[PDB]
Amino acid sequence: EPSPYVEFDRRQWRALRMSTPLALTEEELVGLRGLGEQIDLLEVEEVYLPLARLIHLQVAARQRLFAATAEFLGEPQQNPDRPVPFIIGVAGSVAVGKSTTARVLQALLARWDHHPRVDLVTTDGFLYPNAELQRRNLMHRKGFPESYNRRALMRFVTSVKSGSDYACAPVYSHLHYDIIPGAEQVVRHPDILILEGLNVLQTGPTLMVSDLFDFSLYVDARIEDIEQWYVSRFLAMRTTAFADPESHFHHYAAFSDSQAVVAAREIWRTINRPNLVENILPTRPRATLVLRKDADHSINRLRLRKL
Amino acid sequence: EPSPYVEFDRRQWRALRMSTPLALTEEELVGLRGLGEQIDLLEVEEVYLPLARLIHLQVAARQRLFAATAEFLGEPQQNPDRPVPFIIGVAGSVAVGKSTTARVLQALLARWDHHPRVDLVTTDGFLYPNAELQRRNLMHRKGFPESYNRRALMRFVTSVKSGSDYACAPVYSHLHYDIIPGAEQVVRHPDILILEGLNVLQTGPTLMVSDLFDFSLYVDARIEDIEQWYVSRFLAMRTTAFADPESHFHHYAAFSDSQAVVAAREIWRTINRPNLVENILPTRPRATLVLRKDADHSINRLRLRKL
Ligand SMILES: Nc1nc2c(ncn2[C@@H]2O[C@H](COP(=O)(O)OP(=O)(O)O)[C@@H](O)[C@H]2O)c(=O)[nH]1
Numbered sequence: 126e127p128s129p130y131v132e133f134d135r136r137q138w139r140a141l142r143m144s145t146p147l148a149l150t151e152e153e154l155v156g157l158r159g160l161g162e163q164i165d166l167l168e169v170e171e172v173y174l175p176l177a178r179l180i181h182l183q184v185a186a187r188q189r190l191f192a193a194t195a196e197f198l199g200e201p202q203q204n205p206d207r208p209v210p211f212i213i214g215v216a217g218s219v220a221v222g223k224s225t226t227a228r229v230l231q232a233l234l235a236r237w238d239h240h241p242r243v244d245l246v247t248t249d250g251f252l253y254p255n256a257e258l259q260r261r262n263l264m265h266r267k268g269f270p271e272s273y274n275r276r277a278l279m280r281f282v283t284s285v286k287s288g289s290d291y292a293c294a295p296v297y298s299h300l301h302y303d304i305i306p307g308a309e310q311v312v313r314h315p316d317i318l319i320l321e322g323l324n325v326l327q328t329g330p331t332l333m334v335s336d337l338f339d340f341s342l343y344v345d346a347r348i349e350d351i352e353q354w355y356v357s358r359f360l361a362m363r364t365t366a367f368a369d370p371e372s373h374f375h376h377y378a379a380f381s382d383s384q385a386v387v388a389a390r391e392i393w394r395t396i397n398r399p400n401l402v403e404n405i406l407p408t409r410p411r412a413t414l415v416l417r418k419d420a421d422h423s424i425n426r427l428r429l430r431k432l
Numbered sequence: 433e434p435s436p437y438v439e440f441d442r443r444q445w446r447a448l449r450m451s452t453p454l455a456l457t458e459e460e461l462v463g464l465r466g467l468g469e470q471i472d473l474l475e476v477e478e479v480y481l482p483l484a485r486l487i488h489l490q491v492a493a494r495q496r497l498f499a500a501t502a503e504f505l506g507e508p509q510q511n512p513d514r515p516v517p518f519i520i521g522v523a524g525s526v527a528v529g530k531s532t533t534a535r536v537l538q539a540l541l542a543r544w545d546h547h548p549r550v551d552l553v554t555t556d557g558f559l560y561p562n563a564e565l566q567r568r569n570l571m572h573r574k575g576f577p578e579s580y581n582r583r584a585l586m587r588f589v590t591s592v593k594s595g596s597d598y599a600c601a602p603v604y605s606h607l608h609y610d611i612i613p614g615a616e617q618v619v620r621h622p623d624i625l626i627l628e629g630l631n632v633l634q635t636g637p638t639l640m641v642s643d644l645f646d647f648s649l650y651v652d653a654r655i656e657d658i659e660q661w662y663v664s665r666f667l668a669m670r671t672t673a674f675a676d677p678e679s680h681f682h683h684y685a686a687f688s689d690s691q692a693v694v695a696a697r698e699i700w701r702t703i704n705r706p707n708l709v710e711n712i713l714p715t716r717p718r719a720t721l722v723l724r725k726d727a728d729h730s731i732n733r734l735r736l737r738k739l
Pocket residue numbers: 159160217218219220221222223224225299300362366374
């Protein structure tokens with residue numbers, strides 16, 4: 126009974142680092158870490174660095190493939206100041222640390238030998254604005270597939286991978302809880318685009334951004350642990366984000382420990398968890414690499430797709 | 433507004449033949465042609481031969497990619513008497529000629545310079561037997577996704593692509609209208625496996641054979657034309673297949689032209705068409721190459737995925 130997958134533990138996996146340089150200081154690592162995330166240089170060393178190696182092995186390999194098609198079409202051939210952008214998806218639950226995995230990966234990859242333009246975009250920017258969600262009645266399904274402008278998102282990534290000189294994404298503000306009027310993120314023919322979001326690995330009756338990925342990561346953990354991380358970060362944000370008077374959730378700053386646990390649980394129960402079960406987890410099987418975290422946020426197992 | 437696709441017409445496309453040899457005689461082409469199919473050597477020349485070229489460009493390119501991963505894993509490295517099998521999917525409606533496109537392609541590819549072992553398997557063999565369909569109440573959804581043992585099918589293709597020495601598929605008989613007791617098709621580490629079926633490009637909450645494809649074809653035509661081909665082949669089979677007294681549909685041999693048109697229409701309406709609309713067509717957007725046929729079965733346009 127064979128498998129498209131091979132499973133590792135951290136021991137097996139860290140061996141695959143080989144010679145790979147560590148280009149990141151502890152101060153630099155700190156600026157990439159999100160609230161509640163526990164990544165240290167050791168984890169960067171034994172987990173992210175084999176990963177960065179595998180990826181770099183594959184950027185080269187994946188180029189041969191667009192070369193083959195261009196050759197077939199009798200095409201000019203790729204000027205090497207402009208190869209076909211490598212697209213990396215990063216998926217998983219709210220509160221699972223996608224954010225941190227993606228910023229760390231971006232950092233590691235920009236410190237490779239040409240200094241590649243490595244852009245990072247979250248699908249937050251492609252949420253429908255609140256007014257448009259209100260109209261669709263989805264103000265309580267923010268993060269579900271249908272709360273996104275998937276067409277706009279597909280246009281964006283398609284534009285980039287097809288060699289456009291610039292592409293624009295809108296920009297979301299967690300604080301204001303909405304898309305920002307007039308804000309844009311401009312991506313300019315990067316060598317590597319990392320696209321980070323809940324649902325980026327979804328599939329469906331139309332071509333989607335998952336179909337454009339040259340590599341993808343799914344950041345995994347036990348559902349009970351992720352709820353714990355989510356509730357616990359909710360309590361912590363009473364004195365970071367919710368403390369701001371502009372915070373859309375400023376009213377939560379005052380809640381007691383237990384009032385807050387109640388609130389955070391009800392949101393996990395009504396939104397983030399059903400989304401995780403119904404939409405996100407069903408995409409796990411396609412990910413090139415699943416990074417399984419233990420209750421302490423520590424990546425301890427990995428599942429690679431060999432097929 | 434760019435696109436993952438590039439569209440051709442037969443003119444544009446036939447130019448991409450370059451030097452490619454034509455290794456097939458008219459007698460040989462005839463034995464690959466299914467009832468009602470109109471393929472001539474010219475179509476093989478201007479349509480199939482560019483296709484065989486593109487594919488062969490990609491077998492090489494796609495090998496670099498499993499090489500990259502094996503290198504990463506610090507693995508032995510592929511002995512060249514046993515590379516990673518290239519998997520080709522062929523999809524589309526009943527009565528659209530998948531059968532013929534796949535047998536022709538198989539033939540063209542086995543006549544390449546090493547003489548590659550090129551196996552061809554239809555998903556017919558992975559239909560649940562009639563007794564098991566009866567029990568599920570699906571005797572009138574033969575061909576719908578749920579009428580297949582998808583697990584068994586995924587095991588089969590996974591086994592092959594992962595380098596197994598042999599793999600077994602069950603075998604379906606159109607005449608007897610069922611899986612054949614005790615029959616097996618044995619596939620032995622081919623260089624190229626072509627997997628042909630209605631739903632082979634489906635996607636879903638688990639890894640599927642579409643996820644293993646290194647290249648895929650969707651054979652397309654206008655829905656009205658495909659119904660015409662289906663009805664018309666139904667009338668023709670009164671004197672070929674239905675004429676056999678063992679034919680499961682022997683009772684149809686007697687029908688008048690118009691009785692037969694009525695019957696064939698009711699089956700198209702109740703089974704094959706809703707399956708085409710609800711399941712098959714929604715997979716078109718993922719195909720590497722769509723081959724669009726005109727009312728005369730002639731492939732006149734093509735849509736390639738460049739991304
Ligand atoms: N201001 C604010 N920031 C939040 C809130 N929730 C999440 N964030 C920020 O959004 C980033 C993304 O978090 P999340 O959506 O859970 O994705 P994750 O990276 O997998 O944890 C996190 O680093 C948080 O800093 C919120 O309620 N208010």
